[PDB]
Structure 1
């Protein structure tokens, strides 16, 4: 008959590793067949073809064969599609496409610490900012301290997101500690700090 455009599948938020491919969907319905147009941060995405890098499939999907985030190209942003035709038009949800990142400077790194048995020790670790959220693990002399868990009155435990806390300091606790952060982008390491039990 003569149905006005409808959006049957909205594009969804997406995080991608730099230079990897990416796809934002736009399943449209309408009679006449609606024409689909894409927008990035309010401006129309000059695509379809031409000597560029953003492609638009027949199903209206926006395809980045290689997602870019450099000085020249920056695909990061808010995207959305509009379906039109003689009778009307429909708009899709605005989805956000962003390239994973991992700032490489620690907010705070642990520093050498001395402490007497029984006393309480605290090693600082402020992992650098990253998206996705970076993961933070502690390593003592090459052996990763496996307590990457969460909520019991254990011995050594992480606190304030990133800081290592040792309640009753024994002598075995002596050693070199360092914390590591990581997400899709890669890995980030703080230098080694020595914990001395006097």
Structure 2
């Protein structure tokens, strides 16, 4: 016996990089088998099943596959809020909405660290702020090519602050703050800690 459609899988939010394909999931049940149609900002989205020229494929399940995420300066027709709608003669079911998003990481830091000159046993503090990014760029540090870990308690890394409680001469070196999101790494310009005594 025939029954109205029901959404089985709603689409989940998606951040993806420019250059990468993407898939928004949807799945319905119904008898007769429901058709699946997608809407972005409440506007019907063309698929290859509508028009062979589309860069978007509607998969057998009704998920929406973007062969390329269009996001240029002056047009970006793919990022936004999406909903799938399942239909048969008996009715319609709509999904919850999902955002589709292109990740972004700037090459150039919000605030570079600063040279510090300090004497043995005195605190050395370096502050950093990474580029704007989505998702937000998390922070790490490097001295003369090698990662810094706060695994060793004499260094405190927290927020944008790197603190060395009691400077050692062996702490003299080139410091860079590193910026990281799904897009890639980004390195600040190098900072000189100098240690007197």
Q: Structure 2 length normalisation: TM-score?
A: 0.89
State which of 67, 78, 86 in structure 2 corresponds to 1:65.
Answer: 67
Aligned residues: 193
Is the Cα contact below 8 Å between 1:102 and 1:185 reproduced in 2? yes
User: 1:30: Cα distance to partner?
Assistant: 1.2
Quick one: distance in 1 between partners of 2:14 and 2:144? Answer: 38
Question: Which 5+ residue runs of structure 2 have no aligned equivalent?
Answer: none
Quick one: distance in 1 between partners of 2:111 and 2:100? Answer: 30
User: 1:190: Cα distance to partner?
Assistant: 0.6
Q: Which consecutive segments of 4 or more residues in structure 1 shift more than 4 A?
A: none
The farther-off stretch of 43-52 and 136-145 is 43-52
* Counterparts of residues 8-157 of structure 1 (less than 5 Å): 8-47=8-47, 48-50=49-51, 51-71=53-73, 72-147=75-150, 154-157=153-156
Tell me the secondary structure at the aligned position of residue 3 of structure 2: coil
Is the Cα contact below 8 Å between 1:49 and 1:56 reproduced in 2? no
User: 1:110: Cα distance to partner?
Assistant: 0.6
Tell me the secondary structure at the aligned position of residue 172 of structure 1: helix
Q: Match for residue 180 of structure 1?
A: 178
User: RMSD across aligned C-alpha pairs, in angstroms?
Assistant: 1.8
Quick one: distance in 2 between partners of 1:74 and 1:145? Answer: 42
